[PDB]
Symmetry: D2
Subunit: 226 residues, 4 copies
């Protein structure tokens, strides 16, 4: 009763135990300030097109997985409004490049929970019953209840999407993989500030027989999802 998705370097999940009850989609950090028109990344002159590219592929995967009753998880990078969870080095770096965490930005206080720019874009917005993780780090496990939630949901397989490929998505994939989760990265459903770094982060997954999991794409996933 095994089911696989075509993937590189191996068909995923490794053991073919692919079911709605044991598999989650995670959509990482698809937040207005990071990928929306008029947010701080846009206003700062970064190559926003590369982080907007995955929106439509993610929307298709999200719709397909919702329709088949898979677990859906979302994450948002951000800080408590009093900045109690903000490391000093993280703050200092953000100030130095002109996007100081907690400082006023075009869509509210930058990377601050409760602010408009911090929230998930409307095109990928969560619905009731979809867990949202609020993460103070780049990895979604650090200082959150993500692992507790995955354990109570009995999730074994995670399909990763979102931004950026080399920062938050890679970090979360690496954390999950170390703990024994079986992870699939959808290459057309992620993007980064630097396309080369996006491509390299993907390549890194595949080495050593799939050191962090396996890699596929939205079409292959939607076509073969049970």
């Amino acid at each position: 009763n095994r089911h696989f998705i075509d993937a590189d370097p191996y068909p995923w999940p490794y053991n073919g135990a692919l079911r709605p009850d044991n598999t989650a989609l995670i959509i990482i950090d698809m937040q207005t300030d990071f990928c929306g028109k008029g947010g701080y990344v846009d206003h700062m002159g970064y190559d926003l097109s590369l982080v907007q590219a995955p929106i439509e592929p993610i929307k298709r995967v999200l719709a397909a997985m919702r329709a088949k009753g898979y677990h859906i998880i979302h994450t948002r990078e951000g800080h408590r409004p009093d900045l109690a969870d903000l490391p000093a080095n993280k703050r200092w770096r953000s100030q130095r490049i002109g996007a100081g965490i907690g400082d006023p930005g075009p869509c509210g206080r930058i990377l601050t929970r409760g602010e408009p720019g911090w929230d998930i874009i409307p095109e990928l917005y969560p619905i009731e019953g979809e867990t949202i993780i609020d993460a103070p780090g780049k990895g979604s496990f650090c200082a959150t209840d993500l692992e507790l939630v995955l354990n109570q949901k009995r999730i074994e397989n995670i399909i990763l999407t979102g931004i950026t490929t080399d920062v938050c998505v890679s970090t979360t994939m690496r954390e999950a993989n170390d703990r024994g989760y079986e992870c699939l990265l959808l290459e057309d459903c992620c993007g980064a500030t630097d396309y080369g770094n996006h491509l390299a982060a993907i390549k890194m997954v595949k080495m050593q027989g799939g050191v962090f999991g396996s890699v596929s794409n939205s079409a292959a996933l939607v076509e073969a999802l049970p």
Copy 2:
């Protein structure tokens, strides 16, 4: 002369550590996974067919940094990737992948059971071997924090700054750097003191650190570190 207790290492994209609070008592070198298994002739990496020269290149630069930091009384930490001999800490997917490529964790190899604690090939290479008082972390994951006492030890030592070296750049070194950075540690990657299975991935992992004003920390090299280390 005007003297300061703030000290920096020339680094990219910013002089490191960010606040200049660089002292023996608050700074550690970490040497990641310099094991016969990752960089010597008969280990898991060798078994997978990779070019050992890429992962041996950092040995001499690491040794120079290690000697300098030992001499000035900095904290020194070492890590080893590996599993309990009964494999109780080995995820099924990790095991399966290693078997599929012909380097099964726990399977017999030329230097003992692959990636298995207590086996000859699993140990740190003699030229970078720990000495007394240097904490060794035994990690079942690619990130040295997961399921270990690394964080507990860093906290009791009051370490604020970490200088990262070892292998591989894109797997264990990058993962550990990311974990440390998320928790607030201030991290410096020494680019000539790491290496990978694929040189492009090594270079990209280094570039990833520098983006967004040093998203994971900053990057320097052994010569610049040794020259400016207080």
Copy 3:
């Protein structure tokens, strides 16, 4: 420049390093359903006076520590409204005793975040800049950002207050102590609905030369606080 509070079994903190910048008060779980008139605990016929007794002593300690600029932290036990963070055993036990988590109670859904009964009582309500931890467990560290926050605040010493002495306060003290925090339990600022269990939890702290820290009272704290 050492300062100590009279305490049993040793004057606290052990090294006398007692300052506003390195010391936090934590007020654990002073929530309406647990200690308020008409909450679920009151309706079940527990002796609410035992969990109300700490309110006035806590108020005194809180006022003194606020005035001197110490760190103040609050905790609330509770679950996400979709119950994604709720272990099945925890749920089952709560149902069996007629106080099912997420079920309708006299002050809203029991132990559910955002419900009236779940919030902190008005007499001990947080003010801006006082971090609130929302905990799905009895120990306030599990699956939260408490440790991350303590680390960024450079907190070394923790003064524990709140309820219940033997469940959430003891668990949090044990977690903190294992990580190296230096903890003071204020015996008149905690309570449990079984007074014997309260007394025993306190005794447990003191054994082996203060195995979990030391124990004092609100008057001794306020008198000697620097």
Copy 4:
């Protein structure tokens, strides 16, 4: 009529809650049965406490251990202790131990107190591990803190934990609380634990039972061995 649900008579509810009791999903944990905690010349003896209270659980544990080994249950052991360079030793923990005359790392009759690799730190011969039984080396009172215990339980797919060992109110209770918060279903065997003060042992057990079994449920060696599938 047969069922694959199985329960152990326990207080306040029959355990495990859902009757899903199998060798593959259930572990015994034996906490800190070390010469340091229950032997002459160890840490606990140095602090003046009565060793009979912490030796009492030895024979009941031995019986449970034998029964669970014979039926192929997972067996886990823990040892409280520190790296020999004391890198994992909080300063307050050390200071307290010195103040009462049982300093961690200090020389004792059975080697350096609470120090990994020393004779006094090892598990007593009567309850010694065998191959395939995971041993956790814990720098804290709770066996989860800074260890791989949770990773191991997750890879073994363990759902149910039966707790034994010493002391009831310190290491056993702490580990039970940690496990319970994460969703593990825990049974404390009251005759298979003991403490420095019998009243504190009894109270730690009572604390488990309140609020419908806030930390799990409680039974005894005879009831467990009689009903273990």
